[PDB]
Design a binder for this molecule. Structure first.
Ligand code: HEM
Ligand code: HEM
Ligand code: HEM
Ligand code: HEM
Ligand SMILES: Cc1n[nH]cc1-c1cnc(N)c(O[C@@H](C)c2cc(F)ccc2-n2cccn2)c1
Ligand SMILES: Cc1n[nH]cc1-c1cnc(N)c(O[C@@H](C)c2cc(F)ccc2-n2cccn2)c1
Lengths: 146, 141, 141, 146
C-alpha cells in the first residue's frame, strides 16, 4: 500500500492512541454480531448467541487483541503486506477455509470501531487512509487464493 | 431480511438523527467521495469540494429517502419505486457503490452518535441499508 | 427484488424441470462440491462420492425447497422460515456458498434445459436464487 | 493457475469446439442482461434496453469476441495470468473503473454459456477446471488493485 506522508502521519497519530484492549475485541465482536455466519469459525469460544455474550466473551477480546496486532504489523510494513501476512494468509485460506470477502468485512468493521472510538477525529481524509490500509491487509491475507 | 428487532433498532437509531439527517447524509457522501474516488464518476455535474452546496443538498435528499424507507420498512419496493427507477433503470449504479455508501453512512453514525451505535444497532442498520440498496439497484417494475 | 416478468419466467423455467428436480438438485450439489471444495466442509457427515445416496436425497430436498419457494415467491420469509432457522441460525452458512450453489444450479439448468435457459430466464432465475439465498442466510425470527 | 494434465486436456478439448463468433458475445450479452448495471460501461454500444436488443447488438458480439480471445490467451498462459493480463488489468481498474467483482460475474456467465453450449459434455469435473481458469482470469484482471 502507498500512502502520502500526510496520510502516513494521520494514520500513525490516531493508531498510537488506540485502546489495545478494546478496539480489536470490538472489531471481532462486531464482525460476529453484524455478520453472524462468521461465528461458525469461532465455535471454540463458547457463548456467542447474543451481542452481549459476544462483546463480554474473553476469547473474542483476547483473539481481537491478536487481530489488532496483525493489523498493527501490517501498518509497520505497508510496503510489503504480502510478505508480512504470508503464513497468516496460509492459515486462513488453506486451514481455516475463510472466504476472503470476510477479510474485507472485518477491515470495514475495524474502520467503524475507529470511527466509534475517535468520533470527529476520525475525519473523511483519515478514514480514506485507513481504507487503503484495511484493503491492503484484506488483499494481502487473500494472497493464498491469488 | 429484517427481523422485528432490526426494524425497531433502525427506527430508534435513525429517529435519533432527526434534524441532523442532512448533515450526516452529506458527510457520508463526502466520506464515500474521499475513500472511494470511483464513486465520484456518478456525479460529474457535482461540485464535490468541501462545504459544497450540492453535496449538502444531496445529503439531505439521501437522508430523507432513508427516513421515508424507515417509515415504510415493510413496503420499500412500493415506497422507493421512483428511486429504484432512478438508480437501477436510469443511473445503472453498480451495487458495490451502495455497499461503500452504506459503510460510509455507518462510519458517520459511528462517529457522531457513539451512544446509539451499539453492535446490535450496527447489525440492524447494515441489514437495513443492504435491504434499501437491493431495492434501489434492482429492476422490478 | 423480483419484477412480475421474473416471477413468470421462474415459474415457467422451474415448471419445465418437473420430475428431474431431484437429479438437477443432486447435480448442482456435485458441481458445487467439485468446483468449490470448501463447501464440502458443511457436509462432513455426507458420503460425497459419485452416485451418492445422500447427495441424491439431499438434491431432492433442495429442489423441493426451491419448488415450494416458487409456489410462495411473494411469501418466502414465511414459507422458508424453517430453512432460515436451519441455514442462518443453526448452520451459519457463509452466504458466499449460496452464490456458488446458485451458480451451480444455473449451470445445471443451462446444461439440461438449453431451450428454456434464455438470457431473460437466466436473469430472472439468478434474481430468484439471490432472494432465496438472502432469506436462508438471514436471521429474521 | 495449476491444472492436472487430465483437467488441462478436458479444458483444451471443450475449448477447441467453442463457437468463437457466438460464445463471447453470449457471455457479454448475458452479463449485461443478468447484471444490468454492467450496461453503464457499454453506453457507446447504443440499444441495450431489452435482452433481444443486447443479444442482437453487433458491438456486444464484436466486443464479446475480444473478451473470449482474452480468455483464450489466458488458457494459453495459465502459469502467468498476472503478466498476460497486466495491461488489461490497467485498463479496467484505472481507465474504465470496473469493480473487480464484475470480473468474477463475467467469468461465471462464461461458464453458464459453456454449460448452455456443451450441455451434458460440460461435466462437473470439466466445470471445476473451468472455475480455476475463470477465477484465475478475474484475479489477474483485479491485480492492479492488489
Ligand atoms: C483481514 C483481517 C484478519 C486478520 C488480520 C486476522 C488475523 C488473525 C490472527 C493474527 C490470527 C491468529 C494466528 C495464530 O494462531 O497465531 C487469526 C486466527 C484466526 N482467524 Fe483471523 N484474521 C482476520 C480475519 C479473519 C476472518 C474474517 C475470519 C473468519 C470470519 C478469521 C478467522 C480466524 C480463526 C478462526 C482463527 C483461528 C483462531 C483460533 O485458534 O481460535 N480471521 N486471525
Ligand atoms: C441508500 C443509498 C442511496 C439512497 C437512499 C440514494 C438516494 C438518492 C436520492 C433521494 C436522490 C435524489 C433524486 C431525486 O430527487 O429524484 C438520489 C440521486 C442520485 N443518486 Fe442516489 N442514493 C443512494 C445511493 C447512491 C449511490 C451509491 C450512488 C452512486 C455512487 C448514487 C448516485 C446518485 C446520483 C448520481 C443521483 C442524481 C444526482 C443529481 O442529479 O443531482 N446514489 N439518490
Ligand atoms: C438455495 C439454496 C439452498 C436450499 C434451497 C437449501 C435447502 C436445504 C434443504 C431443503 C435442506 C433439508 C433440511 C431439512 O429437511 O430440514 C438443507 C439442508 C442443509 N443444507 Fe441447504 N440449501 C441450500 C443451500 C445450502 C448451501 C449453500 C449449503 C452449504 C454449502 C447448505 C448446507 C446444508 C446442510 C449442511 C444441510 C444439512 C444436511 C443434512 O444434515 O443432511 N445448504 N438445505
Ligand atoms: C474478467 C473478464 C474480462 C475480460 C477478459 C475482459 C476483456 C476485455 C478486453 C480484451 C477488452 C479490450 C481491450 C482493448 O481495448 O484492446 C476489454 C475492454 C473493456 N472491458 Fe473488459 N473484460 C472483462 C471484464 C469486464 C467487465 C466485468 C466489464 C464491465 C462490466 C468490462 C468492461 C470493459 C469495457 C467498458 C471495455 C472498453 C471496450 C470499449 O472501448 O468499448 N470488462 N475487456
Ligand atoms: C427476499 C428478501 N430479502 N429481504 C427481504 C426480502 C423479502 C421477500 N419477500 C417478502 N414478502 C418480504 O416482506 C417484507 C415485508 C418482510 C417480511 C418478513 F417476513 C420479514 C422481513 C421483511 N422485511 C421487510 C423489509 C426487509 N425485510 C421481504
Ligand atoms: C428488500 C427486498 N429485496 N428483495 C425483496 C425484498 C422485499 C422487500 N419488501 C417487500 N415488501 C417485498 O415484498 C415482495 C412480496 C415483493 C414485492 C414487490 F413489490 C416486488 C417484489 C417482491 N418480491 C417477492 C419476492 C422477491 N421480490 C420484497
Amino acid at each position: 500500500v502507498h500512502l502520502t506522508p500526510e496520510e502516513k502521519s494521520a494514520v500513525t497519530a490516531l493508531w498510537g492512541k488506540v485502546n489495545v484492549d478494546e478496539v480489536g475485541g470490538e472489531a471481532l465482536g462486531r464482525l460476529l454480531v453484524v455478520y453472524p455466519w462468521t461465528q461458525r469459525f469461532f465455535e471454540s469460544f463458547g457463548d456467542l448467541s447474543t451481542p452481549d455474550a459476544v462483546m463480554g466473551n474473553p476469547k473474542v477480546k483476547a483473539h481481537g487483541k491478536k487481530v489488532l496486532g496483525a493489523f498493527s504489523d501490517g501498518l509497520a510494513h505497508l510496503d510489503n503486506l504480502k510478505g508480512t501476512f504470508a503464513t497468516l494468509s496460509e492459515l486462513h485460506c488453506d486451514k481455516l477455509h475463510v472466504d476472503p470477502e470476510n477479510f474485507r468485512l472485518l477491515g470495514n468493521v475495524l474502520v467503524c470501531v475507529l470511527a466509534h472510538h475517535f468520533g470527529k477525529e476520525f475525519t473523511p481524509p483519515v478514514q480514506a487512509a485507513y481504507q487503503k490500509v484495511v484493503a491492503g491487509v484484506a488483499n494481502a491475507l487473500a494472497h493464498k487464493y491469488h | 431480511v429484517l427481523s422485528p428487532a432490526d426494524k425497531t433498532n433502525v427506527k430508534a437509531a435513525w429517529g435519533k438523527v432527526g434534524a441532523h439527517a442532512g448533515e450526516y447524509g452529506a458527510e457520508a457522501l463526502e466520506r464515500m467521495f474521499l475513500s472511494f474516488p470511483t464513486t465520484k464518476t456518478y456525479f460529474p455535474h457535482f461540485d464535490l469540494s468541501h462545504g459544497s452546496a450540492q453535496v449538502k443538498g444531496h445529503g439531505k435528499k439521501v437522508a430523507d429517502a432513508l427516513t421515508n424507507a424507515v417509515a415504510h420498512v415493510d413496503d420499500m419496493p412500493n415506497a422507493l419505486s421512483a428511486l429504484s427507477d432512478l438508480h437501477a433503470h436510469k443511473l445503472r449504479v453498480d451495487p458495490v457503490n451502495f455497499k461503500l455508501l452504506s459503510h460510509c453512512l455507518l462510519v458517520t453514525l459511528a462517529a457522531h452518535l457513539p451512544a446509539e451505535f451499539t453492535p446490535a444497532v450496527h447489525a440492524s442498520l447494515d441489514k437495513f441499508l443492504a435491504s434499501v440498496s437491493t431495492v434501489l439497484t434492482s429492476k422490478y417494475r
